[PDB]
Paper text:
[name]-1 ([name]) is the primordial member of the [name] family of EF-hand Ca2+-binding proteins. It interacts with both the G-protein-coupled receptor (GPCR) dopamine D2 receptor (D2R), regulating its internalization and surface expression, and the cognate kinases [name] and GRK2. Here, we report the determination of the crystal structures of [name] [name] in complex with peptides derived from D2R and [name], as well as the structures of [name] alone and in a C-terminal truncated form. Consequently, in the Ca2+-bound state, [name] folds in such a way that the two lobes are oriented to jointly present a large, solvent-exposed, concave hydrophobic crevice onto which peptide, proteins, and other hydrophobic molecules can dock and bind.
The crystal structure of rat [name] (hereafter referred to simply as [name]) includes four canonical EF- hand folds; the overall fold is similar to that adopted by human Ca2+/[name] (27) and its yeast ortholog frequenin. Electron density consistent with three Ca2+ ions in EF2, EF3, and EF4 was observed; as expected for the [name] family of proteins, EF1 does not bind Ca2+ (5). EF1 and EF2 form the N-lobe and EF3 and EF4 the C-lobe; intra-lobe hydrophobic and hydrogen bond interactions help to stabilize the conformation of the two lobes. Residues Pro-177–Leu-183 form the final helix 10 (H10), which makes several hydrophobic contacts with the C-lobe as follows: Val-180 → Leu-97, Leu-183 → Leu-97, Leu-183 → Leu-101, Ile-179 → Leu-101, and Ile-179 → Met-156. The crystal structure contained two copies of [name] in the asymmetric unit, related by noncrystallographic 2-fold symmetry. However, analysis of rat [name] by SEC MALLS shows that [name] is monomeric in solution with an estimated molecular mass of 21,880 ± 200 daltons. In the absence of D2C, the C-terminal segment residue Pro-177–Leu-183 forms α-helix 10 (H10), which makes hydrophobic intramolecular side-chain interactions, hydrogen bonds, and ionic contacts with helices 5, 6, and 8. Helix 10 forms one edge of the large ligand-binding hydrophobic crevice, rather than occupying the hydrophobic ligand-binding crevice. At first glance, the mobility of the C-terminal region observed in the NMR experiments appears to contradict the observation of a single conformational state in the crystal structure of the full-length protein, where this region forms a well defined helix at the edge of the hydrophobic crevice. However, it is likely that this conformation is one of many structures adopted by the C-terminal region in solution.
Numbering used by the authors: 2 to 50, 60 to 131, 139 to 189
């Protein structure tokens, strides 16, 4: 008598209120989620399914409570921010992605780890090192080798390409 094939009504209401989705959209996302992960808990191996490193970094941000599983509430809220969030919401989310040790700063090495993963997944951009050097030249204002949330927000907003990439809604 499986009890998690659909959401409880109160949870449909909760999740609709916490995201940019309609009730119908929340239920549609659950249908697909539970089909692909009947346990209701998506683990790192499942999320994975060369992209290994970057999928693992994204997995950790989806995993809000850090218990090694992405449950639906986590899945749908991450989808909400990354697909439909405002520019500032998406920037806060991206900062969490890059801040690997959750200390409130993105170091050069933290960023390098992410950018390498993206690459693993034009001469002046042909290494992760070059890409990071450029980002830090543009965003690190006190030259201490790390980005505060403010440095990352303001730095990102200065660059038209970054603004474009974070200003989409359902990919458009
Ligand atoms: Ca979790
Ligand atoms: Ca950090
Ligand atoms: Ca700095
Ligand atoms: Na600009």
């Amino acid at each position: 008598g499986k009890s998690n094939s659909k959401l409880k009504p109160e949870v449909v209401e909760e999740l609709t209120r916490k995201t940019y989705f309609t009730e119908k959209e929340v239920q549609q996302w659950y249908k697909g989620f539970i089909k692909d992960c009947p346990s209701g808990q998506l683990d790192a191996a499942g999320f994975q399914k060369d992209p290994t490193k970057f999928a693992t970094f994204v997995f950790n941000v989806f995993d809000e409570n850090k218990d090694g599983r992405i449950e639906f509430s986590e899945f749908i809220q991450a989808l909400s921010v990354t697909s439909r969030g405002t520019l500032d919401e998406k920037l806060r989310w991206a900062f969490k992605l890059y801040d690997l040790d959750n200390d409130g700063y993105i170091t050069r090495n933290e960023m390098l780890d992410i950018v390498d993963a993206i690459y693993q997944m034009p001469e002046e951009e042909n290494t992760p090192e070059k890409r990071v050097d450029r980002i830090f030249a543009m965003m690190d204002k006190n030259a201490d080798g790390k980005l505060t949330l403010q440095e990352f927000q303001e730095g990102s907003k200065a660059d038209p390409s970054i603004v474009q990439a974070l200003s989409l809604y359902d990919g458009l």
